[PDB]
Here is the input.
Amino acid sequence: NVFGVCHIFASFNDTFVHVTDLSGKETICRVTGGMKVKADRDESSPYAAMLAAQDVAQKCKELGITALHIKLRATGGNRTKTPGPGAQSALRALARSGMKIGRIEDVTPIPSDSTRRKGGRRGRRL
RNA sequence: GGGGCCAUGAUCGAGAGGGACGGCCGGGGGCAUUCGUAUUGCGCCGCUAGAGGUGAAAUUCUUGGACCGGCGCAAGACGGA
Here is the structure.
């Protein structure tokens, strides 16, 4: 089995699935939900991430990638740490599309102590 | 102005305090260092067209390579759990 590393930037307003080699140096294939939907409002929807990892499996099989290490990633830093809605739809679409998954681990950029986050002391009053 | 004489003259030790002293204790304070990232900026490597953001949209960034992945580099805040 040709092991790989799959970087899933599961955040809000967009969902990224980035498949690279074992070192993460060369990008084998990467797509976004906006590449499959007409309106950018449906980017964070799990249906867009469902179509994203689907065609990725073909590009992984065409080049020879069979297994993919899951590297789940949220926005991190000052912003939220919980991954977006595409964290599970893209992960399930990867295994269901005839691939292999192994050694799942999430890498979210959590800071020891960040700077002042966007929005004042009163917070985003939406 | 020399002795004698007196039970010869100082109550303490505050469920007040000061200070000493012993083992400490604590995000008390000043200053100098160590470290952790992250945000942001830049270079290189790799692939691709949208990406940022929003309830939705747009400004904005984008085949002058944006966003994203790695190796890095630099500066300034902050000191999470």
In short: The first strand of chain A starts at residue 5 and ends at 10. Residues 5, 7, 9, 12-14, 16, 18-21, 23-32, 34-35, 39-41, 43, 71, 76-78, 109-117, 126 of chain A lie near RNA strand B (CB under 10 Å from a C1'). Chain A is about 25% helix and 25% strand.
